[PDB]
Amino acid sequence: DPFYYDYETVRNGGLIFAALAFIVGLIIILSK
Amino acid sequence: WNSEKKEFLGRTGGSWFKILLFYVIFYGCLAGIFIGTIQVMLLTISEFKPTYQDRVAPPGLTQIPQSQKTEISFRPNDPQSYESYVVSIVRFLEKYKDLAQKDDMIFEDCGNVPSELKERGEYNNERGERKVCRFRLEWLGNCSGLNDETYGYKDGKPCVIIKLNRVLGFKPKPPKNESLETYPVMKYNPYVLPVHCTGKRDEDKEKVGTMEYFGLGGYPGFPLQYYPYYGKLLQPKYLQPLMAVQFTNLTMDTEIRIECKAYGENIGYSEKDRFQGRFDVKIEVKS
Amino acid sequence: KERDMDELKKEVSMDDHKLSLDELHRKYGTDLSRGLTPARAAEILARDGPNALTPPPTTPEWVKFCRQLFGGFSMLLWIGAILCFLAYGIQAATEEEPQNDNLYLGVVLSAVVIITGCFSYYQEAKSSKIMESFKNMVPQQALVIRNGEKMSINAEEVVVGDLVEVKGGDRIPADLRIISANGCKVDNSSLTGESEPQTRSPDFTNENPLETRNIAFFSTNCVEGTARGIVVYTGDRTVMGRIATLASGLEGGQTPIAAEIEHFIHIITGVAVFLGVSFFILSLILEYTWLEAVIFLIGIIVANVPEGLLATVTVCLTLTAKRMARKNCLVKNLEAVETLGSTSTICSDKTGTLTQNRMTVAHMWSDNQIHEADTTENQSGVSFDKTSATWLALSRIAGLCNRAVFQANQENLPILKRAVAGDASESALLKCIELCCGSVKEMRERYTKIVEIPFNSTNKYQLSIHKNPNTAEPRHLLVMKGAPERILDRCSSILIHGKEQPLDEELKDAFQNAYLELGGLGERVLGFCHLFLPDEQFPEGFQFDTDDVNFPLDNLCFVGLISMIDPPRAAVPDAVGKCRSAGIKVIMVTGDHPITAKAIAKGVGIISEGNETVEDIAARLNIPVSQVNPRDAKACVVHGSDLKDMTSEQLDDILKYHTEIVFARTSPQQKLIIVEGCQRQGAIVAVTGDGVNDSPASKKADIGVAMGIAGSDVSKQAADMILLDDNFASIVTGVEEGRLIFDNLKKSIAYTLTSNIPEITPFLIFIIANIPLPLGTVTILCIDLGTDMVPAISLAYEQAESDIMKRQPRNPKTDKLVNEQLISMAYGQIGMIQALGGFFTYFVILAENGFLPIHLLGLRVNWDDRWINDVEDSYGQQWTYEQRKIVEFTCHTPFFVTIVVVQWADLVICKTRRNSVFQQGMKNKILIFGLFEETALAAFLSYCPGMGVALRMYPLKPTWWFCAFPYSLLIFVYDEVRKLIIRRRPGGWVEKETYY
Ligand code: BEF
Ligand SMILES: [Mg+2]
């Protein structure tokens, strides 16, 4: 059915993104 | 006091025409873009298909007198006490008269008994404007079932039509003959979609109501020969089924509550949305 | 009638110091050797007040916190929460969900008002609470004489007109009329800025009773000697008591930034009420009864608010206030932090401020040649050639001949900045010897002092004699110093490279011309001489005596002069070199004398070499000083004597027609009006000082600097800035920063103001095209105050796009912070495209789901209705309520992903005001971090579970993300082709309509 959307997938994926870019920012502000 | 300046309007009127002509050239470009963008995004909307519909998954059971808060409160005496609710039913069914439905080029006379689904090809435009199944005021006995016996509309005893939301394409599946507790309903589970109402939900209930259901050829639900829906553009002046429930033995000067659920695999219920899969009305026939 | 009181305090004080002592004793009724009776003393001590300043009138309450909570901006937010708690009391007529929505919005708006107003009231509070904080005192108990009997009583039981004796070490208990004295020198450095110690005498000497000698002053310690003096003024009637009180009852004035803040909050509320009205009008025009026609007026006046431009402002500053905390420039209040980069004229005191107030070896005379010592605090300069015999002679002379000796714990401290008990000169000398020529510990104990002769009354000399340790000549050694004219009278032999000579009149006038050439230079000069003794006439064991001359007072052997002066702080001069290169005017204000000031001003660069004064041009042409025209003198020395006889326009003419200005012998009161004459030009003024003489002048300067250690306790208590290390080069770093925070701020505002165009136009066209709600308020709350938080913080660590110190200081009336072209950009242009991409985000969603753009006109009506569960789209689908409302909130949330998207393009084109962004680059790390967090946050908020439930934001289908792309793109393109045509066409149109 076109009446069912893999909501749980892009979520678990938008939070990976929210995990990746933030620690790259934890990487950038700590230049040693 | 800077509004007026020696031969110059407000803020440097002298270069007035510059600033403005820039704000006329810029915004009209800002507009000639955005509209390019929107006109693009309208070229991608499929002409006959909505791209996303998942958010209408469990359709819902509505009423004709879309009251203020699902409460029909009126005096069987006062003509105006009920004019609201009734004019609503009058207008609601204004589009439904057999003579409004005359020309046969876009209309088609279907079985007078609940039939199988009327697949008319595919949802595309290859075919021409598809025909709409008709609907005659009869199938609703008493409550708006012809001129005879219903001048008032509920004036005496209350009654109300329940309706299924239109959902494009929905092939409603009724529960199988192995009915997972579907209360009193007759063995016409093959070609219909039933409903049944209750005073309260799942505990002790102020049970006060004798119900009588009017349907096509006399069943309690939704015929299968009208679905699925194919859309306005494909199907204009299409008429979806209506179904009526009437409350006869009702306490007048008391208010009770009524829940009307609809059953099947293709239907769901939501705790946060009481109008998804079921239906609710309070009533009070005060006099 | 206390304004008449505050006007008798800006006036230079007056007195009655010049009487016969019999007349003193007749007007006050007291004995000059017996004082008065403790009956008459317990009579006057309760007649006016204990000899005590009133405590600071300011001991303020805390309910003035309300003002921050209010203003003009926080009101709109108070009518915001009020009228969402109202809408919700209205939402009680049924069973409603705002158990997690509109109740929570009034408290959210209640909290910005309250958390915002806790932050600013703590910012301006530091000015009230911590800018009047300078305390650490030892109460000194006075030596009073009463009914004959010397009795020491506490400082406060003292009264007016009784006898007091002081000695060396005692603080002056109040303001006295010296009736008797003996060798008494006192230190009035703190009250008048007088450098070296001034002697004191009963005799009436000057008239300006300040520089007179028959009067002492409160808070001045008596340096040496002992004296007797009658009490004239007690408590707050003192001179210094008039000065703290004039320091405390003046206005700080407003810092160059908060004025914009208020005039900013004005424009936001006036376009908010402008909109709230003409649309309040149109919503009662259409249909909405008085009930949701007012709820919208909340929906908008409240949505127009940059809810978190206030935290982006507050950190935009903290980070400037931090970078300045890195450059040894501390601010009590965060908004004096920009004051310096905008200053045009700096006022500075000489003593304790520019200088260390410590007499030092400047120049020396040996082998008819002049050698400049090293005159810095940290020994970064030029040491003379120290190999010839003249110096080794001249050196042991000064080093043996002194009463000066080091103190116990002076070993690790710099040899200069360490404490010395002894005269100023005997300090300066002792110092430059222990410095240039090794240690004087084993050098003053090597020689045995037989008899010495301290400073005399007649002539000028100090001498001593010692044995010969040398193995060549066992002859006795004799040494002495004295003034250059009275020693030249008693001297003849000369010394060169180890061999003697006599006085020829040729070199006697090259000496009379290197004494008036080193002494017109402001330095103080002393002649050093020695003589062997005829060891045949005086044997190796004869202990001479002091009744008679025991050795030749003539035919002596002169060695060399040695010059000294109160020298400047090491970092001073370069620091001044900087302030001028930046075009700052620099003016010198000192209570010191016009010759030591003139020397000190010529040597620090306030007065460039070769500028001539009204007096230097008049003595060079041997003409009366009245002849010269005052236009040809670029500089000018203005005695404070003409400075009491002057008006506003004359001064106005001095400051206008003279570049290098120096004021001398100007009372503390006179330093204030100086700051007030430099402020009748409209320029900015930064006042930097040492003692209490700069209290009123640091008080009414736009920003006052104190000295951290050499600073007294009342001109520190007014200064709006502190130089703890007393490093004066710290001011050089401060002009650079107040001029950088200025420019990086202009970027921080323009970031959040552009947002306020794709925040409002939703709530706008909504009532217009009567479409469903495109942008919720929960959403405007996370743009102003949620995600942009950290982007608009990172934008103020931005750097200098060019050479900051190259351009001149800004012009307050012209160069504005928020000007009408910054506006023309953020609201006029950039935010418009921001609206156009978010709106385009809006139409793509509702159209792809079923509602064509052309069909949503006149829809919001049936749309915002909770009981129309059958609403037909352009595909004929019947939508319940929570279903179609679900599609709004997921048209609220993507409009918010689209904004962060454009707030990328806008965070990168605001990062540079003039330069292309491939020229300034992305070297900023925090800003990188700011894009990654402002995006990870936003992606966390949509897809986080139960986000639709608490906040009513749902997760995004992916195809949505990329609807702000060419919009964030085109935006980057526009402002970049703008920041290149203004790089190629400076001359008008392109640069003039836009540049903010
Ligand atoms: F302290 Be300054 F020399 F007036
Ligand atoms: Mg001073």
Numbering used by the authors:
A (entry chain G): 17 to 48
B (entry chain B): 17 to 303
C (entry chain A): 21 to 1016
From the paper:
The Na+,K+-ATPase generates electrochemical gradients of Na+ and K+ across the plasma membrane via a functional cycle that includes various phosphoenzyme intermediates. The enzyme is a binary complex of a large α-subunit of the P-type ATPase family responsible for ion transport and enzymatic reaction and a β-subunit acting as a chaperone and functional modulator. Furthermore, regulatory FXYD proteins may associate with the complex in a tissue-dependent manner.
Indeed, the datasets for Rb+-soaked E2–BeFx (here referred to as quick soak and long soak corresponding to 10 mM, 20 s and 50 mM, 3 h, respectively) produced strong anomalous difference peaks (5.8–8.4 σ) at the cation-binding sites, reflecting exchange of Mg2+ with Rb+. Quantitative determination of Rb+ occupancy was challenging because of the low resolution of the datasets, but occupancy analyses through molecular replacement with single-wavelength anomalous diffraction refinement (MR-SAD, see Experimental procedures section) appeared consistent with two fully occupied binding sites for both protomers in the long Rb+ soak (occupancy > 0.75). For simplicity, the protomers will therefore in the following be referred to as the initial (Rb)E2–BeFx binding form (quick soak conformations), the early (Rb2)E2–BeFx binding form (long soak protomer 1), and the late (Rb2)E2–BeFx binding form (long soak protomer 2) when discussing structural changes. In the next step, reaching the late (Rb2)E2–BeFx form, the αM1–M2 helices are further translated toward to extracellular side (∼4.5 Å) and ∼6° lateral tilted toward the cytosolic side. The unwinding enables the A domain to rotate ∼7 ° around the phosphorylation site of the P domain (toward the membrane).
